Design a protein around this motif. Structure first.
Motif, PDB file in Angstrom:
ATOM      1  N   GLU B 108     190.660 -11.238  16.066  1.00 10.59           N
ATOM      2  CA  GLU B 108     190.190 -12.616  15.975  1.00 10.59           C
ATOM      3  C   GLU B 108     190.770 -13.321  14.757  1.00 10.59           C
ATOM      4  O   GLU B 108     191.082 -14.517  14.815  1.00 10.59           O
ATOM      5  N   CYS B 109     190.920 -12.603  13.644  1.00  9.80           N
ATOM      6  CA  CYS B 109     191.423 -13.229  12.426  1.00  9.80           C
ATOM      7  C   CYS B 109     192.835 -13.765  12.625  1.00  9.80           C
ATOM      8  O   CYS B 109     193.139 -14.900  12.244  1.00  9.80           O
ATOM      9  N   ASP B 112     193.013 -17.071  14.867  1.00  8.10           N
ATOM     10  CA  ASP B 112     192.713 -18.335  14.205  1.00  8.10           C
ATOM     11  C   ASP B 112     193.758 -18.687  13.153  1.00  8.10           C
ATOM     12  O   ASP B 112     194.181 -19.844  13.057  1.00  8.10           O
ATOM     13  N   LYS B 113     194.186 -17.706  12.356  1.00 17.05           N
ATOM     14  CA  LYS B 113     195.036 -17.994  11.207  1.00 17.05           C
ATOM     15  C   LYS B 113     196.508 -18.113  11.584  1.00 17.05           C
ATOM     16  O   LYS B 113     197.261 -18.804  10.890  1.00 17.05           O
TER      17      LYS B 113
END
Ligand SMILES: CCCCCCCCCCCCCCCCCC(=O)OC[C@H](COP(=O)([O-])OCC(O)COP(=O)([O-])OC[C@@H](COC(=O)CCCCCCCCCCCCCCCCC)OC(=O)CCCCCCCCCCCCCCCCC)OC(=O)CCCCCCCCCCCCCCCCC
Ligand SMILES: CCCCCCCCCCCCCCCCCC(=O)OC[C@H](COP(=O)([O-])OCC(O)COP(=O)([O-])OC[C@@H](COC(=O)CCCCCCCCCCCCCCCCC)OC(=O)CCCCCCCCCCCCCCCCC)OC(=O)CCCCCCCCCCCCCCCCC
Ligand SMILES: CCCCCCCCCCCCCCCCCC(=O)OC[C@H](COP(=O)([O-])OCC[N+](C)(C)C)OC(=O)CCCCCCCCCCCCCCCCC
Ligand SMILES: CCCCCCCCCCCCCCCCCC(=O)OC[C@H](COP(=O)([O-])OCC[N+](C)(C)C)OC(=O)CCCCCCCCCCCCCCCCC
Ligand SMILES: CCCCCCCCCCCCCCCCCC(=O)OC[C@H](COP(=O)([O-])OCC[N+](C)(C)C)OC(=O)CCCCCCCCCCCCCCCCC
Ligand SMILES: CCCCCCCCCCCCCCCCCC(=O)OC[C@H](COP(=O)(O)OCCN)OC(=O)CCCCCCCCCCCCCCCCC
Ligand SMILES: CCCCCCCCCCCCCCCCCC(=O)OC[C@H](COP(=O)(O)OCCN)OC(=O)CCCCCCCCCCCCCCCCC
Ligand SMILES: CCCCCCCCCCCCCCCCCC(=O)OC[C@H](COP(=O)(O)OCCN)OC(=O)CCCCCCCCCCCCCCCCC
Ligand SMILES: CCCCCCCCCCCCCCCCCC(=O)OC[C@H](COP(=O)(O)OCCN)OC(=O)CCCCCCCCCCCCCCCCC
Ligand SMILES: CCCCCCCCCCCC(=O)OC[C@H](COP(=O)(O)OCC[N+](C)(C)C)OC(=O)CCCCCCCCCCC
Lengths: 168, 171, 347, 98, 98, 96, 83, 316
Positions: B108-109, B112-113
């Motif tokens: 997930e990180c 988004d990033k």
């Protein structure tokens, strides 16, 4: 001295052969052939053959050789020639070992080398499987003809031995 | 015979990727979906040239993308990733299925990033095509010209001239 | 033995020989030999007496040793060429063991001491298989690896076989031993022409099988296994003596019978290669075979030996033996010389 | 060849000479016959494994299966020889001289 | 073969294991796949009488990849020379060779 | 129950195998540079050891062909420490 | 119809072990032919990627070969995720 | 540290075998309405130690053996192999992590027949030889079913690795899908280790082969025999009663796995107390006419069942 494990095992391999080749009593002859078999598996294991090496223990030593000893104890009625042959065998082994360890090159029929067995090993492998295992498993996909003839021969072995041993 | 030509010790030097097998195995799926193009060019080079000396420059490009790939994780998702490969590194077999909970956070990180999407089951094993300007080798095996075949027999099969001609037989 | 098991064992003897002839792999050739030896021992033990047990033992030890040498040649050939294909061997040491392994299986001199003894200790029907069918498999391999066989080795085994088959046969009264030594003598001819023209190796093999099968069939009809017992045939089946005379003359190479054709063609293919001494020595030494064949013709057909009183009881019964293909085999053994040019079908 | 091959190749020679010189027992020679196949088994397996001849990895097993089937047939004859003369001595098997 | 039943019927009984450059499971190559391929393609169709002369270069390479005889002679020479200079104070192995 | 669990294990094997595929290009590049370096390292020592031998060529190929040939253990670790050679030869076979 | 019942009910009484052995062996030979899932066994075995998927040099006329692993072209393992 | 690991495996094995003799004598006693050892130490906890000292300070016989070298080789081989069959056992981490561990245990187990055969020769007694031949024929006959049954189970596992059997049973015990094989595996292990109702060797009134041994040499055969009883029941639990493995709490596995291994070892003692003894011709017919036909049929079924359900396990 651990880098020459294969050669050390082979030397024990030969000494066992000189053991039962001199033909002591069958009880001791079979004993010497079990030692050579175990050493023989050790050599095959160090070349990458694990299934083949273990197949020696299960089928050769734990199979045939048990039948040999079983039949010896029941049909064998439990000298200078034996000692003469045994001593003659060891001397030839010693000289062959002595020369290949001195000049690292011996010519008897073939040109043998003395650098070390490790020098011919392959230097690259990154597979996710055992190459030996894949080949043996191919007996069922590629070796259809081999399976049929081998199976039929084993079946005929049962028929033939019962015919021979009936005696009437 | 000839002399084996080898590259110089300064032609092989490159910045290595010094991270353990657990770090590589944790980032393997994202790594293969981001550095596919430089990777496949190098592999096409190896399976065609059949000589590691012919694909050294492609090899360095593979290293550079991996270094740049890990720096982006170093900037945005460091704690989630450092906690992901620590669980992978704990198991003797380095199993994925023991660390699903930590995988989701790292997955997930990056989404988004960096907008990274984890490839689905069966994607990285697909045969792909790569556009390369390197010419196709003509004689990769360095083989010599094959010996010419024997003259072929052609024409009409007429009966034997006077038969067998075996001693005294007349036909 | 159950009849069905007898058929199954025989078909396995055939299957072993067929596997050798249709295989492009040395492992299947070796498997073919092993399946062949496994199946033939039970037909040698079928009569259950000490002599049969001894014959089966001497055969097993000889053929087992020969097969081990053959497998050693295959492995040496694999080390030096990295392939298994049934063709010329790629190492001279592999060729020697391979050539010697096949020589032991065939029974050529000096690897010959088992042929007289094994053939003597087994019934006539088992001997017929041993001396005719068992020779097909080794000859098939020789046909394929002859380009690499050592010339001095193959010609040396051929010469010894012709001599030892000749001298060995003179001192025999038992019929089974006479055919055994006759078989050794004819093997030398087949392997003598092998380096020069393998086609004549097959022709001599085909003719030998036909003639040998005729003799064993006629011996089995009257249950004769000794020279004397064969000398009563004139007083039981007069026709069978005329057929024995014709076949024995044929086997000796006397024209115009069939048995002169291979000796004729082998001498031709050796003089083309400027081989004059060997064919002459081979042809002269073959007169030893003609001698102990002629001796059987004197005690069987050309003279009337003493009979016994109980023979009169035999005249009242017919021959119930099968005598399969005997009329056809006897004609092929005597009346094929005018068809000599037909050997081209073997090319 | 290599250093290991010398001893494997010399072990086959020893067993061959052992098989060609009988002492008294028939059981003793059968062991020399099964020693020969053991040396051939190891020698072939060394060649196949070292060269990565994958499909030939099954050959040594086939060598073992047929060689053991042959050995079984050999022991059966030895038993039938012993049930006749009371021992497995080769000197008893001498009826076929005449 | 003496009888070419396989070619007549178009059935591959035992040709799949004859050579080590044939199709192997999982495309696993032999160590000398390239050398075997080159020799086979050189000698194809011209009979073995010619191939023994017109494909000798490829064959010697194939036999060098199988038994590695020439390479072991070369390594053996280097080891002796280094050993000879080692027991005279005339040579110094570098740090990464020790 | 066995069919379900075995089917899940095959999906896990593909996932584990695809990770290896994603890493092979990097490992192949490293292996190529490590193999060539060791060949060159031996080339220097050969030149020093045999600069005064009667008719010796440094780095002469024993093959007629000029095609790249995979080195064997003797050519890479010819003049290295025994412990390193032992690990690269029998290390895998002897691990556990 | 009555002959078989008499025969079957007798081996079931005197030789239950052999009756079970032949029934089990008989099912091992028949069911794989009639089983609809036997085709998925081959597909699973073909889907397992032991080797590296060597890429193909691009010539321009290869619309069925993806340029990237995540492109929609090429074989799909969606059927496997649902099996 | 590995050398410490070996000793942490060997000594506890021998101690477990020492106190198995006590437990066997007391479970048998209570099933017979008596107590068993309760005088030598509290609840007979010092009985094993007294027996050991007594045997090792008792004079041995060593009769006029035909060899006198097989007489000393037989107990070395028996005890040496018995301890070797423990090194690949995952509990849950093997001492030696073999890839073909299941095949290693078959190979080493088939060599234990020599100690039975050699001790027959050494005794120099014609009758003692007959007893050795019957024991040998029993052991080889029943390891035909051990090999085929094991192959059938591994078709649902995918490898010969012993630690893969733990993964295979991560959702369910293999006793459920393969209970018919478990029955014939359990009985086949009794016959292998010459246990009642298959103990013709120790079954006086018909014969044993280790009759000429006394004192220490006899105890060596005894120790090897009982270490095989524990080992085979540990193998059975791993094979058919898989215990879940939590990498963070490996001791949890060992406690659960030990309890199963004990319950299966006590089942051996339970079965000894309940049944009479088979006749020699009757245990052979139990193998060649009942187990083998079913084992062969179930092997065919287990080769095909994974294919027709799409449930072939992974190779790795
Ligand atoms: C051109 C080339 C032409 C040359 C051809 C030469 C053929 C001559 C055969 C000998 C004549 C038969 C005879 O006299 O009986 C002897 C003998 C019977 O005498 P017996 O000793 O009292 O009885 C033995 C038992 O007690 C058995 O007693 P039983 O009561 O239990 O009976 C068992 C049952 C058994 O019945 C059978 O015999 C049938 C078995 C199947 C034969 C193969 C069929 C071929 C087709 C399938 C492929 O019945 C018989 O035995 C019938 C008596 C035998 C007559 C049938 C023989 C047919 C041979 C023709 C086919 C040749 C194929 C090669 C032979 C096999 C090689 C090992 O039968 C044989 O076993 C002879 C075997 C033949 C071996 C030589 C084959 C020639 C080799 C060259 C082949 C061509 C290549 C060149
Ligand atoms: C290609 C065309 C080949 C033609 C083959 C047809 C004849 C074979 C079947 C005849 C037979 O039953 O015995 C054969 C065969 C040999 O028995 P045999 O004792 O030699 O036959 C004479 C008896 O007296 C036979 O006397 P029998 O009273 O026991 O039986 C009378 C027999 C009478 O049939 C005959 O004519 C038997 C004689 C026919 C000739 C046999 C040799 C086969 C042809 C060989 C050709 C050699 C060519 C050489 C050329 C070189 C120069 C270019 O009639 C038949 O059985 C024909 C049935 C039709 C099916 O019997 C078997 O065991 C296999 C069946
Ligand atoms: C010594 C006293 C007598 C011992 C008898 C028992 C022999 C032990 C069995 C041999 C070892 C084995 O089975 O390997 C399997 C196992 C198979 O394991 P593997 O196939 O899973 O592979 C292990 C490594 N991986 C998985 C990474 C590939 O072998 C090994 O694990 C390591 C091999 C070491 C090879 C060294 C062997 C030297 C000793 C052999 C000589 C024995 C002489 C016997 C004397 C005669 C008595 C019979
Ligand atoms: C008929 C006479 C002979 C039969 C022999 C019977 C003795 C063999 C043992 C049978 C009973 C099974 C063992 C029960 C005690 C085990 C204790 C234990 O491990 O935890 C409970 C275990 C805990 O389970 P677990 O720790 O073994 O893991 C289970 C594995 N999965 C999750 C895949 C199913 O559960 C029980 O056995 C409850 C009963
Ligand atoms: C949908 C597809 C399904 C396919 C599979 C279907 C399977 C259907 C069921 C098949 C039958 C099941 C096989 C059971 C085994 C039968 C073996 C057999 O031969 O039976 C007859 C045999 C002997 O049968 P018999 O002696 O009565 O007679 C045989 C036949 N006649 C009459 C001709 C001679 O029974 C025995 O094995 C004797 C047992 C010896 C004493 C054993 C003590 C038991 C102690 C309790 C242990 C409990 C098990 C513990 C397991 C623990 C495991 C962790
Ligand atoms: C190459 C080297 C080969 C020669 C090495 C000789 C090795 C054998 C040593 C001699 C030997 O074996 O003993 C003598 C031999 C048989 O032993 P022997 O003492 O005669 O036994 C019966 C006595 N009553 O007595 C003999 O019969 C001689 C056998 C030939 C030696
Ligand atoms: C020992 C004395 C000796 O060297 O005899 C060698 C003799 C002739 O062989 P040769 O190659 O000419 O000798 C080399 C000389 N530079 O040759 C011999 O005497 C060696 C005897 C070998 C007997 C072979 C029996 C058949 C088995 C062949 C398999 C290969 C065995 C030989 C290779 C391994 C070496 C033992
Ligand atoms: C297509 C691929 C598969 C091809 C397989 C072909 C090979 C089969 C190999 C089977 C193994 C060899 C067994 C053959 C021996 C058969 C038994 C026998 O020898 O007969 C002895 C028996 C003696 O009779 P008796 O004792 O006097 O009186 C009672 C007899 N019931 O006499 C008898 O009466 C026995 C009757 C004959 C036995 C017939 C066995 C048939 C087995 C097929 C069953 C399949 C059913 C599967 C469907 C199950 C559905 C639930
Ligand atoms: C529902 C439908 C189910 C199918 C129908 C059931 C199968 C029918 C066959 C079962 C009956 C078998 C014949 C029979 O009754 O044999 C009994 C007989 C026992 O004789 P015996 O024990 O010596 O007598 C002692 C008396 N004091 O035994 C004999 O004489 C011979 C018995 C031979 C048995 C061979 C066992 C090997 C085969 C194992 C099975 C493996 C599968 C075979 C291949 C199947 C292919 C589909
Ligand atoms: C009657 C005797 C018959 C033949 C057996 C010989 C036993 C005694 C040793 C004499 C020969 C010798 O020189 O022994 C020494 C050899 C050493 O060989 P390595 O480990 O490869 O040394 C090479 C590696 N370096 C360079 C580090 C030394 O020992 C053996 O290989 C083991 C023999 C089996 C025990």
């Amino acid at each position: 001295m651990m880098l020459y494990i294969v050669f050390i095992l082979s030397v024990i391999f030969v000494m066992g052969f000189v053991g039962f080749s001199s033909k002591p009593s069958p009880i001791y002859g079979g004993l010497g052939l079990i030692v050579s078999g175990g050493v023989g598996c050790g050599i095959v294991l160090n070349f990458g053959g694990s299934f083949l090496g273990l197949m020696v223990f299960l089928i050769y030593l734990g199979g045939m050789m048990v039948v040999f000893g079983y039949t010896t104890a029941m049909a064998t009625e439990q000298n200078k020639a034996v000692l003469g042959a045994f001593v003659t065998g060891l001397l030839m082994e010693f000289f062959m070992v002595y020369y290949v360890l001195k000049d690292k090159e011996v010519e008897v029929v073939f040109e043998f080398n003395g650098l070390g067995d490790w020098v011919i090993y392959d230097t690259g492998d990154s597979g996710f499987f055992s190459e030996e295992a894949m080949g043996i498993a191919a007996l069922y996909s590629y070796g259809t003809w081999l399976v049929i003839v081998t199976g039929w021969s084993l079946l005929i072995g049962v028929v033939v031995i019962m015919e021979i041993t009936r005696g009437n | 015979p000839g002399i084996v030509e080898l590259p110089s010790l300064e032609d092989l030097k490159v910045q290595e990727v010094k991270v353990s097998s657990s770090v590589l195995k944790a980032a393997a799926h994202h790594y293969g979906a981001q550095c596919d193009k430089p990777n496949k060019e190098f592999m096409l080079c190896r399976w065609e040239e059949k000589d590691p000396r012919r694909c050294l420059e492609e090899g360095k490009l593979v290293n550079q993308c991996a270094l740049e790939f890990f720096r982006q994780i170093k900037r945005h998702c460091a704690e989630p990733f450092t906690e992901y490969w620590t669980c992978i590194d704990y198991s003797g077999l380095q199993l994925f299925r023991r660390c699903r909970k930590q995988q989701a956070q790292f997955d997930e990180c990056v989404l988004d990033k960096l907008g990274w999407v984890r490839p689905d089951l069966g994607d990285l094993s697909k045969v792909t095509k790569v556009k390369t300007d390197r010419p196709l080798p003509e004689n990769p095996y360095h083989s010599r010209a094959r010996p010419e075949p024997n003259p072929e027999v052609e024409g009409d099969l007429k009966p034997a001239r006077h038969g067998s001609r075996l001693f005294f037989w007349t036909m | 033995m159950n009849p069905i098991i007898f058929i199954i064992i025989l078909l396995t003897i055939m299957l072993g020989t067929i596997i050798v002839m249709i295989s492009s792999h040395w492992l299947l050739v070796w498997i073919g030999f092993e399946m062949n030896m496994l199946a033939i021992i039970p037909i040698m033990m079928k009569n259950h007496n000490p002599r049969a047990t001894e014959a089966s033992t001497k055969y097993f030890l000889t053929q087992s040793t020969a097969s081990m040498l053959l497998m050693m040649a295959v492995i040496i050939n694999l080390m030096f060429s990295g392939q298994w294909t049934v063709m010329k061997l790629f190492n001279p040491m592999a060729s020697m063991l391979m050539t010697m392994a096949l020589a032991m299986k065939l029974g050529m001199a000096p690897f010959h001491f088992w042929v007289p003894e094994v053939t003597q200790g087994i019934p006539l029907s088992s001997g017929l298989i041993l001396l005719t069918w068992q020779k097909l498999a080794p000859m098939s391999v020789l046909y394929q690896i002859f380009p690499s066989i050592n010339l001095n080795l193959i010609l040396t085994l051929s010469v010894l076989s012709i001599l030892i088959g000749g001298w060995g046969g003179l001192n025999q009264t038992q019929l089974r031993k006479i055919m055994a030594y006759s078989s050794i003598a004819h093997m030398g001819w087949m392997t003598a022409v092998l380096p020069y023209n393998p086609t004549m190796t097959l022709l001599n093999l085909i003719i030998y099988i036909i003639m040998t099968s005729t003799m064993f069939t006629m011996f089995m009809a009257n249950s004769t296994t000794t020279t004397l017992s064969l000398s009563h045939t004139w007083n039981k089946t007069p026709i069978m003596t005329v057929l024995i005379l014709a076949t024995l003359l044929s086997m000796g190479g006397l024209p115009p019978l069939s048995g002169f054709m291979p000796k004729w063609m082998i001498i031709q293919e050796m003089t083309k290669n400027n081989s004059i001494i060997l064919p002459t020595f081979m042809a002269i030494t073959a007169l030893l075979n003609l001698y102990f064949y002629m001796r059987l013709t004197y005690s069987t057909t050309l003279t009337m030996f003493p009979s016994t009183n109980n023979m009169k009881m035999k005249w009242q019964f017919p021959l119930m033996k099968k005598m399969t293909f005997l009329p056809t085999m006897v004609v092929l053994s005597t009346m094929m010389l005018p068809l000599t040019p037909m050997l081209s079908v073997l090319e | 060849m290599s250093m290991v091959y010398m001893n494997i190749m010399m072990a086959f020679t020893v067993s061959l000479v052992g098989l060609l010189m009988y002492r008294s027992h028939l059981m003793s020679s059968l062991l020399c016959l099964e020693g020969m196949m053991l040396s051939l088994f190891v020698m072939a397996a060394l060649t196949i494994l070292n060269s990565h001849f994958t499909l030939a990895s099954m050959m040594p097993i086939i060598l073992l299966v047929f060689a053991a089937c042959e050995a079984a047939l050999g022991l059966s004859l030895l038993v039938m020889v012993s049930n006749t003369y009371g021992t497995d001595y080769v000197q008893n098997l001498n009826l076929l001289q005449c | 073969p003496f009888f070419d039943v396989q070619k007549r019927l178009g059935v591959d009984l035992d040709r799949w294991m004859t050579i080590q450059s044939a199709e192997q499971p999982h495309k696993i190559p032999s160590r000398c796949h390239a050398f075997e391929k080159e020799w086979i393609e050189c000698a194809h169709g011209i009979g073995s009488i010619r191939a023994e002369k017109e494909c000798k270069i490829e064959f010697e390479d194939f036999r060098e990849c199988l038994l590695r005889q020439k390479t072991m002679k070369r390594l053996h020479a280097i080891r002796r020379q280094r050993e000879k200079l080692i027991k005279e104070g005339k040579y110094t192995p570098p740090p990464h060779h020790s | 129950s066995m069919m379900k669990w075995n089917r899940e294990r095959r999906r896990l094997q593909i996932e584990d195998f695809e990770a290896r595929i994603a890493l092979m290009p990097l490992l192949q590049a490293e292996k190529d540079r490590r193999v060539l370096q060791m060949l060159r390292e031996n080339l220097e020592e050969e030149a020093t050891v045999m600069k005064d031998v009667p008719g010796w060529k440094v780095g002469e190929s024993v093959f007629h062909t000029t095609r790249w040939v995979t080195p064997m253990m003797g050519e890479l670790y010819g003049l290295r420490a025994s412990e390193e050679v032992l690990s690269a030869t029998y290390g895998f076979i002897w691990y556990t | 119809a009555e002959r078989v019942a008499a025969f079957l009910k007798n081996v079931w009484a005197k030789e239950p072990v052999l009756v079970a052995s032949f029934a089990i062996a008989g099912l091992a030979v028949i069911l794989p032919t009639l089983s609809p899932y036997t085709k998925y066994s081959l597909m699973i075995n073909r889907a397992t990627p032991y080797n590296y998927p060597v890429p193909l040099r691009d010539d321009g006329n290869m619309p069925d070969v993806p340029s990237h692993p995540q492109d929609p072209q090429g074989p799909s393992l969606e059927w496997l995720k649902r099996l | 540290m590995f050398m410490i690991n070996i000793l942490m495996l060997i000594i506890p094995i021998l101690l477990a075998v020492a106190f198995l003799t006590l437990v066997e004598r007391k479970v048998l006693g209570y099933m017979q309405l008596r107590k068993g050892p309760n005088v030598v130490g509290p609840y007979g906890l010092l009985q094993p130690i007294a027996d050991a000292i007594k045997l090792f300070i008792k004079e041995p016989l060593r009769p006029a053996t035909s060899s006198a070298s097989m007489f000393i080789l037989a107990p070395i081989m028996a005890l040496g192999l018995a301890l070797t069959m423990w090194i690949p056992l995952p509990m849950p981490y093997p001492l030696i992590n073999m890839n073909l561990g299941v095949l290693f245990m078959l190979a080493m187990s088939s060599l234990a027949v020599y100690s039975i055969l050699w001790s027959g020769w050494a005794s120099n007694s014609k009758y003692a030889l007959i007893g050795a031949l019957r024991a040998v024929a029993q052991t080889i006959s029943y390891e035909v079913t051990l090999a085929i049954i094991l192959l059938s189970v591994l078709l649902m596992s995918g490898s010969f690795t012993l630690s893969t059997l733990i993964t295979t049973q991560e959702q369910m015990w293999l006793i459920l899908p393969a209970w018919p094989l478990a029955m014939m595996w359990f009985i086949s292990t009794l016959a292998e280790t010459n246990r009642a109702p298959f103990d013709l060797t120790e079954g006086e009134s018909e014969l044993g082969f280790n009759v000429e041994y006394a004192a220490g040499p006899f105890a060596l055969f005894f120790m090897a025999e009982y270490a095989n009883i524990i080992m085979m029941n540990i193998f059975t639990a791993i094979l058919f009663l898989g215990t879940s493995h939590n990498p963070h709490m490996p001791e949890l596995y060992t406690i659960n796995f030990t309890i199963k291994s004990l319950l299966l070892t006590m089942s051996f003692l339970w079965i000894r107390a309940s049944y009479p003894r088979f006749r020699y011709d009757q245990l052979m017919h139990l193998l060649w006419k009942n187990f083998l036909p079913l084992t062969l049929a179930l092997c065919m079924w287990h080769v095909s069942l994974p294919i027709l359900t799409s449930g072939i396990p992974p190779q790795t």
